[PDB]
Amino acid sequence: AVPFVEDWDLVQTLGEGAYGEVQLAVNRVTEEAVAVKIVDMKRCPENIKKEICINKMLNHENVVKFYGHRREGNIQYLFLEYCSGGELFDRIEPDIGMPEPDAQRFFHQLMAGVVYLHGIGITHRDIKPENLLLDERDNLKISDFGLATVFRYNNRERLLNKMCGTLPYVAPELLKRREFHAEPVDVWSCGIVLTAMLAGELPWDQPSDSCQEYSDWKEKKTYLNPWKKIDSAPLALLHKILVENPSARITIPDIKKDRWYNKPLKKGAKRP
């Protein structure tokens, strides 16, 4: 009906990934703002195709919305939810973190998003502050499903073996076992994100015995730099999440029962 409602102006670049770029698109008529991910299939046809497939399954308030995609020859155009608050990474002050109440609220929303994904059988596989965006009201949105995969189909769980993610956030089993359950890997990265939000620094380069920082943690040397800046309440939760054995690691239903997770700390939005 309305002529130019399908026209979008690319006003600015939000970020140029190693596999394309993201542009802020504003509708010519409505002025609605959305994020458009541009990927040159000639610069992966399958990879991008799987990302679109997984995105079509997503519908949750803490997961970046997928509005659709446009062929356009070899250049794929993915219309995604625009998060004007930027990355969670940019809300973390180096070496200090952020106020505990803020970290708890973001962690609550992260859990809500991950519970949702796991419930539909998908694992993100690369959870980190750079992939956790914020909307205008600072609501957390899980972003980028380029590495995501289905780990449960027809009520049957599939064990994973693909080594992927980001080293400082990856679970130790991914580096020591051929196969591993998908869920505990995402739980572990959420724990590293919590550590980052509360201390403004990552605890180790990677979870290997060769990594001194990781060995110190297994030895319970919490008097060291990262851990000494946290809390005994949130620290106690981190002690349950960053457990080397994925089978003994805390699950999300149990994280939801954790003392710190349930501690009243933050007031609602100012005047609302």
From Swiss-Prot:
Residues in cross-link Glycyl lysine isopeptide (Lys-Gly) (interchain with G-Cter in ubiquitin): K128
GO cellular component: centrosome; chromatin; condensed nuclear chromosome; cytoplasm; cytosol; extracellular space; intracellular membrane-bounded organelle; nucleoplasm
Catalytic EC class: transferase
Record entry for activity regulation: Activated through phosphorylation predominantly by ATR but also by ATM in response to DNA damage or inhibition of DNA replication. Activation is modulated by several mediators including CLSPN, BRCA1 and FEM1B. Proteolytic cleavage at the C-terminus by SPRTN during normal DNA replication activates the protein kinase activity.
Catalytic activity line of the entry: L-seryl-[protein] + ATP = O-phospho-L-seryl-[protein] + ADP + H(+); L-threonyl-[protein] + ATP = O-phospho-L-threonyl-[protein] + ADP + H(+)
Binding site for ATP: L14, G15, E16, G17, A18, Y19, G20, E21, V22, K37
Known partners and oligomeric status: Interacts (phosphorylated by ATR) with RAD51. Interacts with and phosphorylates CLSPN, an adapter protein that regulates the ATR-dependent phosphorylation of CHEK1. Interacts with BRCA1. Interacts with and phosphorylates CDC25A, CDC25B and CDC25C. Interacts with FBXO6, which regulates CHEK1. Interacts with PPM1D, which regulates CHEK1 through dephosphorylation. Interacts with TIMELESS; DNA damage-dependent. Interacts with FEM1B; activates CHEK1 in response to stress. Interacts with TLK1. Interacts with XPO1 and YWHAZ. Interacts with CDK5RAP3; antagonizes CHEK1.
Role description: Serine/threonine-protein kinase which is required for checkpoint-mediated cell cycle arrest and activation of DNA repair in response to the presence of DNA damage or unreplicated DNA. May also negatively regulate cell cycle progression during unperturbed cell cycles. This regulation is achieved by a number of mechanisms that together help to preserve the integrity of the genome. Recognizes the substrate consensus sequence [R-X-X-S/T]. Binds to and phosphorylates CDC25A, CDC25B and CDC25C.
Family (UniProt): Belongs to the protein kinase superfamily. CAMK Ser/Thr protein kinase family. NIM1 subfamily.
Name of the protein described by the UniProt record: Serine/threonine-protein kinase Chk1
The encoding gene: CHEK1
